[PDB]
C-alpha cells in the first residue's frame, strides 16, 4: 500500500541499528523477559544435557520507531528482520550446543507507539546437573540462565515475567512439577551498577512404571527363583547349574543397567546397591550349596561325626524345624564261608547306616539355610526400596 | 532478451521486500496453503520424531508485480530469489530439527497478472506423540501445524487446499491411510480479528509381518519347547537345565524388545504383557519341576505317604488320566546265617517296592502339570494376541 | 593483465544475473546435463539411503558474455563465482539430506564465444528402494532424478548425455553393472506446463564372498553339529545340553542377522527363510531326543510294548538299517531259603531282559530319526540356497 | 539518544577494519589473553578428544575509538559487532571440530579512551594425548594452544594472564587439579619470524568410586567363586561346569572393558594386566580340576600307583594338611561253589580298597591346589592393584 | 597508523579479485603447493575414510599488490581476508566430507614485493582404499589428491615442495612411515595444455601390541583349553559341555571381530582364516568326543569288536603309545541252586571283562586323537600367523 510504503521509507531514515533506542542516554532501557515452555524433548542422564522446545518472549520500547496513525491510516503494525533494528543480545549461559546460540531469528513486531515484541523459537540444549542418588525415583532441578552478554545496568535492566506453560504438551516419561523463576542482581567491584538476570528452574519427576516393570520385578522374581536350589534334592546332581546360571543372568542385567547409567562417582545409586546386594545373596547361596554338597557326599570310612555337629544339627536344628529323623569236615568249612558272607553283609549294612546321618545333616542344613536366605532377601529388598524418599506417592501415582 | 532485461529493471524500481503487497492497506491478504507428500522416511518411537519429505505449496496475488504482455512480447513469467520479494513467514510449529526452519529456499514464479507460486522442498522432523499401547498392531496419528509467525488475521488470512498424495512413494514398513487437514480460526482476547491456521494429521498403520516373523512366532516355539521338560523322564537329569536355558533365551528376547521401544509410562505395551506372561509360565514350570524332582528322589523310609496324597494321586488322578500302576550242631549255624541273608534280601525288596509309589506319584503330578500348563499357555497367548482391536485386519492384510 | 581487467570490467555492464540469457525471448534455452560417477560411498539397507560421489556436468550458451579475441590478446576464458552470472537451478528430487542441495558451488568457466561449463562436485545422499527378497544374492537398482525446480519446458530445454564412468573407483562390496539414463516429461498438480527431468538409474550387484563365509557356512556347520546328538549314546547325560546350546547359538545368529536387515513387510528374506528352517529342524531334533530319552529309561513292570510297535521297531527297521539285537528237617529250611534267593535272581534277570529290549528299541528309533533328519536338512538347505535367481553366476564370479 | 547517534556516526567515519590500530606503525600492538573455564564436559578416551566450556578473554587498546565524554555526556561505552572493527585472529591450534573455529562472535565493548574488551564464549573440542597406563587411577594433562595465525611477533605482542576458575562447575567423574599456563615463542618452516603462542594445561584426576564398584569388586568376587571347584566332592559331576562358566563370564567382562578401552600400543593397561592374570588363574584351575578328575576315576588292576607319587601324596602332604587316611561228593561240590563265591567277593573288596586309596590321593591333591591357588590369586591381585602410583590417594579421597 | 591506512586505501583502487594477477595475460602464474602434517586423527576401516589434521601451504606472486617501503616506513606486510583478493581454487579431489571443502579461510599475508602466503588449516576426510588382507599386521597407503578446479597450464601451473612432518604428534596406534609426493602433468584431447597437480601418499603401519594382547593370545589359550576333552575320563559326564562352551565363547569372539572389520569381498582376512581354522579344530574335537563316548558305552552283548579294530587299537597303538592293557535229594537241589548262582556270577564276570576291553579301546582312541589334534592346532596356528609379510618386523618393533 501507498501509506505503508511511505511509512517503511520514513522509519528507516537516519536509523542506526547499533544504538540503544532511548530518549535519554543516562537512563537505562527497560526490557521484559519471559519463557514459554512447549515440550521436553529428552533428558540425557549419561551426557547430562537437557533438551527442550522453548519460545522466548522479550519486549521493550523504541523511541524512534513511532508514528501517528492519522497520517498513515490503515497501517498499525510493522515488522523488521534482524540487523535492520536494534535487539537485545540475550542468550543462554548454560548452552551445550555446538553453536552457542540455537535460536531462529524471526521478525520483530512493532507497535504504532514504539513497543517491540520478539518471540524467537528454538531447541535449547542446556547442561544441568543430573542427581542420580535415588534413581529411578528422581526429582530433577535443571536451571536455565539468561541475560545480556555485553550490556550492564545503566545500559539496560532486565525484568522477569512468569513462565507460560499453557501450551505444554505432557511427556510420557517425565512429570512437570513446575517452573518458577527469579530476578537477581550482581554488583561488581568498580561500579555500583546492578547487573540483573533471570533464571528459570525446571523441576521434573520421573514416572517409574516403565523402569519398575522392566527392571525391578524381573530381577526380584529371578532372585527369588534362585532360592529353589535349596529345595532340590542333592541326589539329583544338578544343583550348581541353577545357581551359576542365575548368577550369569544377574550379571547381564547389571551390565545393561551400567550401560544406561552415567559414570559419576558422587554417590552410590540405589539400583546399583540393590544389584550388589543381590550379587552377594546369590554368591552366598552358591557357597552354601557347595557346603551341603560336600556334606552329602561324605566318605563313610573317613572321620567320625564331631560331637558338636551331632548335638547341634541332628538335635536342636531338628527340634526347631520339627523334622523327623527316620531311624563232616567240609561242613565246618562251608559254615565258615557262609559266616564270612554274612559278616560281610553285616559290615556293609553298618557302613551304609553311617551315610544316612550325613545325608540327613545335609538336608537339615539345606532347610535351615533356605529359611535364613528367604528371610534375608525379603528384608534387604524391602529396606533398600523403601529407604528412598519420594517412593510411596510415586508408586501411588504411577502404578495406580 | 532485451524485453525481459527492461522488465526486470522496471519491476524492482521502488520495490520494498518489507511491505505487504496489498493495494488497500486496511484489508487483509489472502494466502492459499497446501501440501504435497512424497515419502515417509522414518518413524522413531524411541525419540518420538517423524521424518517426512514434503513440498510446501503457497500462492498469493502480489499487486506491484504486474505488467502488460503486449509491451513486453515473449515474456510470460519472472522469477525472484530469496530476499528480493515479499514472502509469507510460514513456519512449522512442532519441529524437532535443531535449525527450526528446514526448507530449501527456492525461487518464486510470478505470472503476468501478479500471481506468485512458492514451492519449497525440504525434509521435516516433527515431534508427534507415538502411542505404543497396541504395538506392534499399531495405528498412529501425527499432526503438522503450520501458520504465519508474525502476521495477524487482519493482515494475512490462510486458506486450505487439500493435500496431494499423487506423488507418494509407498513405504515398506508403514501403510498410509490418508492425510486429511482442517482450517481453524483462533481468536485473541484483545481483538476481534481471527488467526487462521491449517493443521495436517497424517494417519499411518504399521505392517505386522516383520515383527510377526521375528518376535511373535519364535517366542511361541520357545515357550512350547519349554513344556518338553514334562515329557522328559526324571531318571536322566536334564530338567532344570532345560528350564533355565529356555528362561535365559526368553530374557535376551525381552532385552531386545525392551531396547527397541521407548521408556514411556502411559500404559503397559501388549508385547510387554506377552513377555511377562511367558516369564511367569516358565518360572512356574521350573518350580513344578523342582517339586517333581523332590517327589522322585524320596528316601524310602524317610517318611510315609499321607492319606490325602495316597488317595488322590494314586487313585483319583490315575482315574482321570487313565494310567495303570506299575505292578547237627554245625548245621543250625548255617541255618541262621542263610535265613539272615534271606531276611536282608526281603527287607531290601520291600524297601525298593516302597519307592515305586513315590516314582509313580511323581509321574502322575508331572503329567497333570503338563496338561495344565499346555492349556494355560494357549489360552493366555490367544487372549493377549486377540485383544488388539485391529488384529484381524492386520493378519488379513499383511499375511493373507 | 590490463586486457583481462578491462574485459572483466566491460563484461558486467548492465548485466542482470536474474534474466535468462537468450537472444530471442520466445524460444527456450538449451541445457545439456550429464553426470560423472566417481565412487559409491555406502549403501544403507536399514535406512534405504544411498551415498555416492558424483560430478555434475551442465553446459549452456550465454548470449551476452561474448568478446572478440583480437581486441583482448591474452585472455581466452573467464571464470565467474556464485551469484554473479545466471545459472540453472538443477537439484535432486530424491535428496535424503538435511539440506536439499548438497553441491559445492565452484566457478563457471566461460568460452571466448559464450559457452559456459559448470562442474560442481559433491556427496549426494538419496533415498532409493532396496530389495532384500534375495539377500545376499540381490541386485539393486537406485534412481537419481534431476531437474530444474522453477523452469518449465518453454524456458529450459533440458537435454541428456551419457554418464561418464572413466574415473570410477571400484567398491569393495558392490560391483557396478552400469548406469543408463532417460529423459521424461511430467505434469504436476501445481501448474499447467510440463517439467522435463533426467533420471539416471544405477544398477549394481552385491559381492557374496564375505556374507557367504560369515553368515552361511557357520550356520550350516552348527546345524550339522546339531545332528551329532543322534550318535551320542543315551547312557551319557549330554544330549539335551547339545541340542539346547545349539538352539542358543542359532538364536544369537538369527538375532544379529535381524538387526542388520531392514524392517520391511513386503517379502520374506531368503536368509530369514533359511534361519526359520534351521530353527524348525533343531526344534524337532530336540523333541525326538526327548522321545528317545523317555523310551530308553522306560520303567519295566509297567506297560508291555504294543504288538504293532514291536513288529515295526524290532523287526522292520531293525532289518532295514542292518542292526542286530542284543542276543535233618533243617535241610528243607535251607532248601527254601536258597530257592527264594534263586527266584529273586531269576525275576531280576527277566526285568533286565525287558529293559534291554526297550533300550534296543530306543536305539533303533534314534538311528532312523538320524537318517531322516540328515537327508531332510540337506535337501532343505540346497533347495533354499538354489531357489534364488542369478545364484550360480554370483557363486562363480565371487568364489571362482 | 542524539549524542549516541552522533558519536556512532563520528567513530565509523574514515575507519578501515583492516588496519592494525596503532599510533606508530613500527611499534607492536599489545594484546592480553586469558581464559575462564566453566565446565569440563567430556573426556573421550577412544577418540582422544576433550570437550570443555570456555570463555576467551582478550583486551587491547584501540587508537582511533577515543572521544571526550564532555561532548557526549550520557554515553560512556559503545559496542561494535563482528566485521566492523579490527579484531585479533586468536584461534585454537589443537581443534578437533570439523569446523576449525568453534566460537560465538559477540560484541566488542569499548572504553571512552579506546580500551577494547572481547569475551567470546564457545564450546571447544581439542585433541589431547590420553594416557591409560594407570587406568582407572590416572591423572591426565591436556593442553590448549592459542595464538594469532597471521600476525607475527613484531606486530602483535601476545601476553598471558592467569586463568579464571571462579565459575567452575564441578564434574561428577573428573576432579580438577589446576590450570597453569605459559607463553612460548616458536619458529615455523613457513617464515623467518617468531610466532608467540599461549598454552594452557588442564590437569584432571579421575574419581574412582564408580569403576571400583562396577568393575574391580565384581571381578574379585567371581574370581573367588571360581576357586570353589576345589571344595566340590568329585562324585558330583559339576566342577568343569563351574570353572568353564566362570571363564565365560570373565571373557564377557574382558570384552566389555576392551569396548571401553581405546586401541593403543604404547603400554599395557593395568586393568588389562589384571584381567589377563585372572584369565590364567581360572585356566589353571580348570586344568587342575581335569587332573583331579582323571585321578579320581582310576581303573584298578591297570596302572599301579608309582612309589614316588605314593609317598609324596600319602605320607608328607597328607600329614601336613592334617588329613587322615581312610582305613558226600555233593558236599564237596557245594564247598567248591561257596569257595568261588567268597573268593570273588574278596577280590571285589581288594579292588574297592585300591579305589579308596586313589580317591584319597585325589582329595589330597585337591586340597593342596586349593591352598596354593588361594594364596597365588590374593598375592597377584594385591600386587597389581598396589603397583599404581597415587592409588592410596585415590582410595582415601574417593571411598573415605 | 597513518601510512598503514594510506597504503590500504591505495592498494584496493581498481582492484578486481576476479582477475588473475599477472603482468602478461598469455603467460601462466606459478603457484607453489605443499603440505604440513599435524596428526592422524582416525583411520576408519569400516567406512574406509581417513581423518587428518593438515595445514595447506600455497604461495604465489601478485603484480598489483606492490609498494615501495620508503614511502610507508612502518608497514612491511599487509593482510587481506577472504573475498578481497584473488586466491587459487585448490581443493581435495577425493574428499569424503558432507561439505566438499573442509578448510578454515584465514588471512593472506602479502610482502612488500607482492609475494602472498596462504596457510589454511582444517580437518580433512578423504576416502582411501584400505587393504585388510593382512589384519592386524597391516600397512596402508592413502592418497591425497590436490589440484585446481578451473585453471590449467596457461593459467596455473602447480609446483611442489616436500611435505613437512615437523611438529607431527605421534599417534598411539598408527606409526608413520613417510609422506612422499609427486607432481605430474596430464594432457587433454584437444590441446597440448598441461594440468599439473600434486598428490601425497601417506604410508602408515599399524601397531599390533593391543590386537595381539586382545585377540590372538586369548583365542590361542581357549583353543588349547578345548583340547582338555581328551584327558577327562569318560565316567564324568562333562565331556560334551567343555567343547560346546568353548565353541560358544569362540563364537562371541568371532562376533566381535566381525563387528570391527569391514564387509569387503576382495580377499579373505588373515584373522578370518585363523578363526575358521580354530572353528574347524573344535568341531572335529566335538565329533571325536562323541565317537569316543559311543565307543565307551558299548553294551557287552551288542556285538563283537572287528578283527581290524582289535588288532590296531589293542596291540599296535597300545605299544606305540606305551600303554598296558589292564590284566538226601534236597541236598542235590541245594547243590543245583548254588550251581545256578555261581553260573550267574560267572556270566556277569565275562560281561564286565568284555566291557572293560571296550573301555580300553575307547581310552586308546582318546589318547591317539589327543596327540593328533595337539600337533595339528600348533601347525595351523604357526602357519597362519607366520604367513603374513613383515610379521617378524611387527613383533620385533612392538613386543621388544
Ligand atoms: C617478500 O617475501 C618473499 C618470500 O619468498 C621474498 O622472496 C625471497 O627473497 C630472497 C632474496 O634473495 C630469496 O633468497 C628468496 O628465495 C625469495 N623467496 C622466494 C619464494 O622466491 C621477497 O624477497 C620479500 N620481499 C621483501 C622486500 O622483503
Ligand atoms: C517441477 N517443480 C518442482 C515441483 C513443482 C514444480 C514447481 C513449479 C513452480 C514453482 N516451483 C516448483
Query: DSSP letter string over B274-291?
Result: HHHHHHHHHHHHHHHHHH
Scanning chain E, the segments in alpha helix (DSSP H) are 3-11, 209-211, 217-226, 240-260, 270-296, 307-311, 317-320, 329-386, 391-398
Please judge whether A294 and D172 are an interchain contact, meaning their C-beta atoms are less than 8 angstroms apart: no
Task: Report CA torsion sign: E267, E271, E277, E280.
Answer: negative
User: In this structure, are D193 and D87 located in the same domain?
Assistant: yes
Taking CA atoms only, the protein residue closest to ligand 1 atom 22 is E113
User: Could you tell me the distance, in angstroms and rounded to a whole number, from the CA of residue B193 to the centre of ligand 2?
Assistant: 34
> Closest by alpha carbon to B370, among B227, B274, B272?
B227
State the Cα torsion E243-E248-E253-E256 to the nearest 10°.
170
Are residue A155 and residue A52 in the same domain, yes or no?
yes
Contact E112 CB / ligand 1 (< 6 Å): yes
C-alpha cell at B49: 520424531
Asked if E256 and D254 count as a contact pair (C-beta separation under 8 A), the reply is no
Asked if residue D188 belongs to a known ligand binding site, the reply is yes
Q: Are strands A197-206 and A57-61 parallel, antiparallel or unpaired?
A: unpaired
Q: Tell me whether the omega of the peptide bond preceding residue D136 falls within 30 degrees of 0, making it cis.
A: yes
E166 and E275 belong to one structural domain:
no
Enumerate the residues of chain B whose CB falls inside 8 A of the CB of residue A398: 265
Ligand 1 centroid from CA E147, angstroms: 25
Distance E107 CA to ligand 1 centre (A): 19
Return the residues preceding each gap in chain B, C–N over 2.5 A, or none. 327
Query: Taking the CA atoms of chain E, what radius of gyration do you get in angstroms?
Result: 39
Please, which residues bridge with residue A219 across strands? none
Chain A positions touching B156 (Cβ under 8 A) are none
Q: Could you tell me if the CB of E57 is within 6 A of ligand 1?
A: no
Residue of D nearest to E245 (CA): D244
- Do B333 and B286 reside in the same domain of the chain? yes
For residues C191 and C227, state if they share a domain.
no
DSSP reduced 3-state for C375: helix
What does the block give as the cell for E87? 586466491
Peptide bond into E136 cis (omega under 30): yes
Residues D289 and D229: beta-carbon distance below 8 Å = yes
Cβ-count burial of B16 within 10 angstroms (0-12 exposed, 13-18 middle, 19+ buried)? middle
> Which three cell numbers mark E138?
597391516
Q: How far apart are CA D60 and CA D149, in angstroms?
A: 17
CB crowding A13-22: b at 16 or more within 10 Å, else e? eeeeebbbbb
DSSP for residue E213? I
CA distance E43 to A203: 44
Which run of H or of E encompasses B250?
helix B239-260
Mutation target among D14, D17, D25 for the E interface, most CBs of E within 10 A: D25
For chain A, how many residues are written?
400
Give the span between the Cα atoms of E312 and E306, in whole angstroms: 10
Q: Kindly report whether the peptide bond that precedes residue B136 is cis, defined as omega within 30 degrees of 0.
A: yes
Phi, psi of B260 (to 5 degrees): -65, -45
Q: Nearest chain E Cα to C343, which residue?
A: E337
Q: Which of D213, D362, D367, D381 is nearest to D281 (CA)?
A: D381
Resolution of the experimental model in angstroms, please? 3.2
In chain E, residues with a C-beta closer than 8 Å to the C-beta of C357 are none
Three-class secondary structure of residue D385 per DSSP: helix
B126 in Cβ contact with B42 (< 8 Å): no
Contact yes or no for D91/D140 (Cβ under 8 A): no
| D54 phi and psi angles, rounded to 5 deg | -140, 140
Mutate to test the pocket of ligand 1, among E73, E78, E113, E114 (most ligand atoms within 8 A of CB): E113
Gap between the Cα atoms of D88 and B124, Å rounded = 39
Per-residue burial over D142-156, b = 16 or more CB atoms within 10 Å of its CB, e = otherwise: bbbbbbbbbbbeebb
Give the burial string for B50-66 (b: 16+ CB within 10 Å, else e).
bbbbbbbbbbbbbebbe
The string of DSSP codes covering D73-106 is: SS---EEE-TTSS----EEETTB-SSSS------
List the CATH number of the domain containing E149: 2.70.170.10
In degrees and rounded to multiples of 5, residue C125 shows phi and psi of: -110, 125
* Contact E249 CB / ligand 1 (< 6 Å): no
Angle at D255 between CA D254 and CA D260, to 5 degrees: 95
* Strand extents, DSSP E, chain E: 29-34, 37-44, 49-55, 57-61, 78-80, 90-92, 108-110, 115-118, 121-126, 139-148, 156-160, 174-178, 181-184, 197-206
Q: What whole-number distance in Å separates Cα of residue C90 and Cα of residue E76?
A: 47
CA atoms within 13 A on the CB side of A97: 18
- Rounded alpha-carbon distances, angstroms, from residue C353 to C234, C301, C308, E343, E345: 18, 12, 20, 17, 16
Of the ligands numbered here, which is closest to the C-alpha atom of E117?
1
- Which ligand neighbours the alpha carbon of E61 most closely? 1
Determine contact, residues A118/A82, Cβ cutoff 8 Å: no
Q: Nine-digit cell at E385?
A: 600367523
Q: Are residues D163 and D28 in the same domain?
A: yes
CA D201/CA D192 separation, integer angstroms: 28
- Alpha-carbon distance of A367 to A356, in angstroms, equals 17
- The nearest alpha carbon in chain B to C279 belongs to B218
Are residues C326 and E287, on separate chains, in Cβ contact within 8 Å? no
**Cα–Cα distance measured from residue E249 to residue D283, given in angstroms and rounded to the nearest whole number:** 14
- In chain C, residues with a C-beta closer than 8 Å to the C-beta of B208 are 265
Which ligand sits closest to the CA of C149? Answer: 2
Whole-number Å distance between alpha carbons of A42 and E185: 56
Alpha-carbon distances of C363 from B159, C232, C324, C325, rounded to whole Å: 82, 10, 11, 10
Report how far residue D55's alpha carbon sits from residue D168's, in angstroms, rounded to the nearest whole number: 11
Q: How many domains does chain C have?
A: 2
Do residue C191 and residue B36 have CB atoms under 8 angstroms apart? no
By CB neighbour count within 10 A (0-12 exposed, 13-18 middle, 19+ buried), where does B104 fall?
middle
B371-391: string of b/e by CB count within 10 Å (b at 16+)?
A: eebeebbeebbeeeeeebeee
Rounded CA-CA distance D300/D293 in Å is 15
Range of the domain at D128: 2-206
Which of B108, B119, B122 for a ligand 2 pocket mutation test, highest count of atoms within 8 Å of Cβ?
B119
CB-count burial class (<10 Å; 0-12, 13-18, 19+) for C45: middle
Give dist(CA B387, CA B393) in Å, integer: 13
A34 neighbors A183 (Cβ within 8 angstroms)? no
Handedness of CA E366, E368, E374, E380 (dihedral sign): negative
Give the list of residues 6+ apart from residue D95 with CB closer than 8 angstroms, or none.
Answer: D101, D102, D124, D125, D126, D127, E123
- Whether residues E237 and D237 touch (CB distance < 8 A) is answered with yes
d(CA B43, CA B174): 9
CB-based contact D335 A338, cutoff 8 Å: no
- CA-nearest residue of chain C to B165? C189
| Chain E residues with CB-CB distance to C339 below 8 A | 333, 337
d(CA C16, CA B8): 8
Rounded Cα distance between E91 and E329, Å, is 120
For A52, B363, D249, E87, E155, the CA distances from E83, given in Å and listed in that order, are: 39, 92, 62, 9, 20
Instruction: Find chain D residues with C-beta within 8 A of A237's C-beta.
Output: 236-238
Report the C-alpha gap between B136 and B121 in whole angstroms. Answer: 32
Taking CB atoms and an 8 Å limit, are C123 and E247 in contact across chains?
Answer: no
DSSP 3-state of D252? helix
Which cell is C317 given? Answer: 527297521
**Nearest alpha-carbon partner for D366 in D235, D277, D249:** D235
Determined by cryo-EM
Strands B78-80 and B90-92, bridge-based pairing:
unpaired
Contacts with B332 (C-beta within 8 Å, 6 or more apart), sequence order:
C330
Q: How far apart are CA E211 and CA D258, in angstroms?
A: 10
Three cell numbers written together for B190: 484483545
Cell of E93: 579431489
For C159-185, b/e burial (b = at least 16 CB within 10 A) is: ebeebbeeeeeebbbbbeeebebeeee
Q: Measure the CA–CA gap between E261 and E215, rounded to whole angstroms.
A: 13
Q: Cβ-count burial of E295 within 10 angstroms (0-12 exposed, 13-18 middle, 19+ buried)?
A: buried
Which pairing describes strands A197-206 and B29-34: parallel, antiparallel, or unpaired?
unpaired
**Alpha-carbon distance values, A201 to A35, D135, E185 (Å):** 11, 37, 65
Q: Are residues C172 and C280 in the same domain?
A: no
* Domain end residue (candidates: E207, E229, E249): E207
d(CA E354, CA E234): 17
Residues B201/B143, Cβ–Cβ less than 8 Å: yes
Closest CA in chain D for residue E324: D302
Closest alpha carbon within chain A to D75: A25
And the C-alpha cell for D314?
600319602
User: Looking at chain D, how many residues does it have?
Assistant: 400
A198 is in an annotated binding site: no
Contact A290 D213 (CB under 8 A): no
Q: Residue B92 is placed in which grid cell?
A: 512449522
Check: CB of residue C94 under 8 Å from CB of residue C128: yes
- The answer to whether A208 and A191 are in contact (CB under 8 A) is no
Contacting residues for A341 by C-beta, under 8 A, at least 6 apart = B337, B341, D338, D341, D342, D345
Could you tell me if C258 and C292 lie in one domain? yes
DSSP for residue A230? G
SS3 category, C161: coil
Cα atoms found within 13 Å of the Cα of residue C92, Cβ hemisphere only: 30
Backbone angles phi, psi at C240, to 5 degrees: -60, -40
Who's near E166: CB < 8 A, 6+ residues apart? D189
**Helices B239-260 and B217-226, packing angle to 10 deg:** 160
Q: Number of C-alpha atoms within 13 angstroms, CB side, residue C362?
A: 22
* C-alpha cell read off for C33: 546435463
C-alpha cell at C278: 534351521
C-alpha cell, E338: 548254588
The C-alpha atoms of residue C38 and residue B360 are separated, in whole angstroms, by 77
Tell me the C-alpha distance between D83 and D103, whole Å: 15
Determine which of B80, B342, B364, B395 to mutate to test the interface with C (most C C-beta atoms within 10 Å): B342
Question: Which is nearest to B8 in space by CA: C14, A6, C12?
Answer: C14
A188 annotated as a binding-site residue: yes
Residues in chain E closer than 8 A to C102 (CB atoms): 98
Separation CA E201–CA E211 (nearest Å): 25
Q: Are residues A292 and A169 in the same domain?
A: no
Show the cell assigned to C269.
Answer: 528374506
Contact C293 B398 (CB under 8 A): no
Whether E30 is in the pocket of ligand 1, judged by its Cβ within 6 Å, is: no
- Yes or no: say if C267 and C317 are a contact pair by the CB < 8 Å rule: no
CA distance C109 to E150: 7
Cβ-defined contact of A334 to D332 (cutoff 8 Å): no
Task: Give the number of other Cβ atoms within 10 Å of residue A162's Cβ.
Answer: 10
Q: How far is CA E51 from the centre of its chain?
A: 17
CB contact under 8 Å between D340 and E338, yes or no, is: no
Of E140, E173, E207, at which residue does a domain stop? Answer: E207
Q: Closest ligand to C153 CA? A: 2
Distances (CA, A) of C121 to C89, C101, C106, D160: 15, 11, 8, 44
* Cα distances (angstroms) measured from residue B70 to each of B12, B13, B112, C24: 20, 20, 11, 16
Angle at B66 between CA B64 and CA B70, to 5 degrees: 150
What is the biggest distance separating any 2 CA atoms in chain C, rounded to whole angstroms?
156
Report whether C148 contacts C89 (CB < 8 A): yes
**Cell numbers representing residue D385 in the block:** 592393584
In this structure, are E43 and E12 located in the same domain? yes
Q: Around D283, how many Cα atoms within 13 Å sit in the side-chain half-sphere?
A: 19
Per DSSP, the three-state class of C28 is: coil
Q: Which SS3 state, helix, strand or coil, does residue A36 take? A: strand
The C-alpha cell of E26 is what? 598469455
Of D214, D218, D339, the CB nearest to A337: D339
**Could you count the other beta carbons within 10 Å of the beta carbon of residue E394?**
22
Whether residues E263 and E370 fall in one domain: yes
Residue B195 exposure: Cα atoms within 13 Å on the Cβ side: 14
Longest alpha-carbon distance in chain B: 156
Cα D143 to Cα E169: distance, rounded to the nearest angstrom: 13
Closest CA to E110 of E70, E59, E154: E59
Question: Using a 6 Å cutoff on CB, does residue E159 contact ligand 1?
Answer: no
Q: Are residues E172 and E214 in the same domain?
A: no
| CA pair distance C33, C196, nearest whole angstrom | 12
Q: Is E183 in the pocket of ligand 1 (CB under 6 A)?
A: no
Domain final residue pick, B158, B174, B206: B206
Amino acid at each position: 500500500g501507498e501509506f505503508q510504503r511511505k511509512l517503511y521509507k520514513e522509519l528507516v531514515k537516519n536509523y542506526n541499528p547499533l544504538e540503544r533506542p532511548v530518549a535519554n542516554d543516562s537512563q537505562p532501557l527497560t526490557v521484559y523477559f519471559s519463557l514459554s515452555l512447549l515440550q521436553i524433548m529428552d533428558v540425557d542422564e549419561k551426557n547430562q544435557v537437557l533438551t527442550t522446545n522453548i519460545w522466548l518472549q522479550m519486549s521493550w520500547t523504541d523511541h524512534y520507531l513511532q508514528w501517528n496513525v492519522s497520517e498513515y491510516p490503515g497501517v498499525k503494525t510493522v515488522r523488521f528482520p534482524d540487523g535492520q533494528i536494534w535487539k537485545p543480545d540475550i542468550l543462554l549461559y548454560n548452552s551445550a550446543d555446538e553453536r552457542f546460540d540455537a535460536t531462529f531469528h524471526t521478525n520483530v513486531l512493532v507497535n504504532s507507539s514504539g513497543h517491540c515484541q520478539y518471540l524467537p523459537p528454538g531447541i535449547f540444549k542446556s547442561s544441568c546437573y543430573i542427581d542420580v542418588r535415588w534413581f529411578p525415583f528422581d526429582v530433577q532441578h535443571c536451571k536455565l540462565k539468561f541475560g545480556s552478554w555485553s550490556y550492564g545496568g545503566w545500559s539496560l535492566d532486565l525484568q522477569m515475567q512468569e513462565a507460560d506453560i499453557s501450551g505444554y504438551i505432557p511427556n510420557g516419561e517425565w512429570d512437570l512439577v513446575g517452573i518458577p523463576g527469579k530476578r537477581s542482581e550482581r554488583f561488581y567491584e568498580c561500579c555500583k551498577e546492578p547487573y540483573p538476570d533471570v533464571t528459570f528452574t525446571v523441576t521434573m519427576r520421573r514416572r517409574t512404571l516403565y523402569y519398575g516393570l522392566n527392571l525391578l520385578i524381573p530381577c526380584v522374581l529371578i532372585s527369588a527363583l534362585a532360592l529353589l536350589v535349596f529345595l532340590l534334592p542333592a541326589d539329583s546332581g544338578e544343583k550348581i547349574s541353577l545357581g551359576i546360571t542365575v548368577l550369569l543372568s544377574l550379571t547381564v542385567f547389571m551390565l545393561l543397567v551400567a550401560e544406561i547409567m552415567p559414570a559419576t562417582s558422587d554417590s552410590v545409586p540405589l539400583i546399583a546397591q540393590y544389584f550388589a546386594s543381590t550379587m552377594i545373596i546369590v554368591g552366598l547361596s552358591v557357597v552354601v550349596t557347595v557346603i551341603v554338597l560336600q556334606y552329602h557326599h561324605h566318605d563313610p570310612d573317613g572321620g567320625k561325626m564331631p560331637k558338636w555337629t551331632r548335638v547341634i544339627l541332628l538335635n536342636w536344628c531338628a527340634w526347631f524345624l520339627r523334622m523327623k529323623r527316620p531311624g563232616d569236615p567240609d561242613l565246618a568249612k562251608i559254615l565258615e564261608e557262609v559266616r564270612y558272607i554274612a559278616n560281610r553283609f553285616r559290615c556293609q549294612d553298618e557302613s551304609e547306616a553311617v551315610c544316612s546321618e550325613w545325608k540327613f545333616a545335609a538336608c537339615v542344613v539345606d532347610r535351615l539355610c533356605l529359611m535364613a536366605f528367604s528371610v534375608f532377601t525379603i528384608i534387604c529388598t524391602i529396606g533398600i526400596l523403601m529407604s528412598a524418599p519420594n517412593f510411596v506417592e510415586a508408586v501411588s501415582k504411577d502404578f495406580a
